[PDB]
Enzyme design. Structure first.
Site, PDB file in Angstrom:
ATOM      1  N   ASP A 156       9.894 -14.173   2.928  1.00  0.00           N
ATOM      2  CA  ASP A 156       9.811 -12.717   2.880  1.00  0.00           C
ATOM      3  C   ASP A 156       9.192 -12.231   1.578  1.00  0.00           C
ATOM      4  OD1 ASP A 156      10.131  -9.985   3.126  1.00  0.00           O
ATOM      5  OD2 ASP A 156      12.317 -10.018   2.923  1.00  0.00           O
ATOM      6  N   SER A 173      -5.254  -0.346  -0.107  1.00  0.00           N
ATOM      7  CA  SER A 173      -6.326  -0.530   0.857  1.00  0.00           C
ATOM      8  C   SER A 173      -7.361   0.570   0.689  1.00  0.00           C
ATOM      9  CB  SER A 173      -5.775  -0.532   2.292  1.00  0.00           C
ATOM     10  OG  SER A 173      -6.830  -0.558   3.240  1.00  0.00           O
TER      11      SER A 173
END
Ligand SMILES: Cc1cccc([C@H]2C[C@@H](O)[C@@H](O)[C@@H]2N)c1
Length: 330
Positions: free
Chosen positions: A35, A199
């Protein structure tokens, strides 16, 4: 040193991925959920409330000659999906794909929430975010990666998740045969303890690319792609019959639909998520309404590049003094 381990979807929907991990002496192998959105290594154990264990493999520290109780240490964690666990702490030898760390903090669960109990395939979590998020008290502990880093050939690990197929976590090296083209690297903020990056924008199907900054985290422990409501609305508008359902808890779409791809930007590079990656199947058994793999982050507080996005790429988690993230097509 290096390590290399295969990671396997737990079910037909790629809801999560499990990776075998050797703990203790002699080895006890547990299948853990790697994770990158958390920083605790915790396991089902001989100490877990009996009624809360249902099919998981447990760690028994009393059977490990290298296990040592970390005196006075406790841990307690709650995740973004509302699940939780807590317990005490041992140090022990932990190996992943041939890479060994001695004195790793292994957090032994005394309590786990129902969602962990109900998932027989996941024996615990191995956190790969930054150690500043580790919940052990009163002395915070380091992640497996943090402990291994100095010994690694290169201070990196990579995530190569498969679509309906096995994939690979590598530690300490970049497998140049595992991706196409080049790896595009992008800046990381560690201020929130996550692999947080920005992004450069998105496209829906064959549509024009929208240049827009989207701050989010690379999170292997989250199933779906969570993005701003504007972006998600633009995606599902291209699917006839798709709608946001408050009763189901997100966007659903007719199972007869053909989903468009979703592209996200990494610098000037582009990662394309195929439409079928975004299909998470009937909302309930036999239903003709299917659950979408791209969902709004509005109620989360942060955008999450979870497995739906990451499995479309070869992803480099660069743990150099100034960490960065790398993405390649594959
Ligand atoms: C509501 C719903 C319906 C069908 C499938 C899901 C998936 C999506 C992801 O959150 C995973 O944990 C769930 N099993 C959710």
């Amino acid at each position: 040193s290096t390590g290399s381990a295969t990671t396997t979807p737990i079910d037909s929907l790629d809801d999560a991925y499990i990776t075998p991990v050797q703990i203790g002496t002699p080895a006890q192998t547990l299948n853990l959920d790697f994770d990158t959105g958390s920083s605790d290594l915790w396991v089902f154990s001989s100490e877990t409330t009996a009624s809360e264990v249902d099919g998981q493999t447990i760690y028994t520290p009393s059977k490990s000659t290298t296990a040592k109780l970390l005196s006075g240490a406790t841990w307690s964690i709650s995740y973004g999906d509302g699940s939780s666990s807590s317990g005490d702490v041992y140090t022990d030898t932990v190996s992943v794909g041939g890479l060994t760390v001695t004195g790793q903090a292994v957090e032994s669960a005394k309590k786990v929430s129902s969602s962990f109990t109900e998932d027989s395939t996941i024996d615990g979590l191995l956190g790969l975010a930054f150690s500043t998020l580790n919940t052990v008290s009163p002395t915070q502990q380091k992640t497996f990666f943090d402990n291994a880093k100095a010994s690694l050939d290169s201070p990196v690990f990579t995530a190569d998740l498969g679509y309906h197929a096995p994939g690979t976590y590598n530690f300490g090296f970049i497998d140049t045969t595992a991706y196409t083209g080049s790896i595009t690297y992008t800046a990381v903020s560690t201020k929130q303890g996550f692999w947080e990056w920005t992004s450069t924008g998105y496209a829906v199907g064959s549509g024009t690319f929208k240049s827009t900054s989207i701050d989010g985290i690379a999170d292997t422990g989250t199933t779906l792609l969570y993005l701003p409501a504007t972006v998600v609305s633009a995606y599902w508008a291209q699917v006839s019959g798709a709608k946001s359902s408050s009763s189901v808890g997100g966007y659903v779409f007719p199972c007869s639909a053909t989903l468009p791809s979703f592209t996200f930007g990494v610098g000037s590079a582009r990662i394309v998520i195929p439409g079928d990656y975004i299909d998470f199947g009937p909302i309930s058994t036999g239903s003709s309404s299917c659950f979408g793999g791209i969902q709004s982050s509005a109620g989360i507080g942060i955008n999450i590049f979870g497995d739906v996005a990451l499995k479309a790429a070869f992803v480099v988690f660069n743990g150099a003094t100034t960490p960065t993230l790398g993405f390649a097509s594959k």
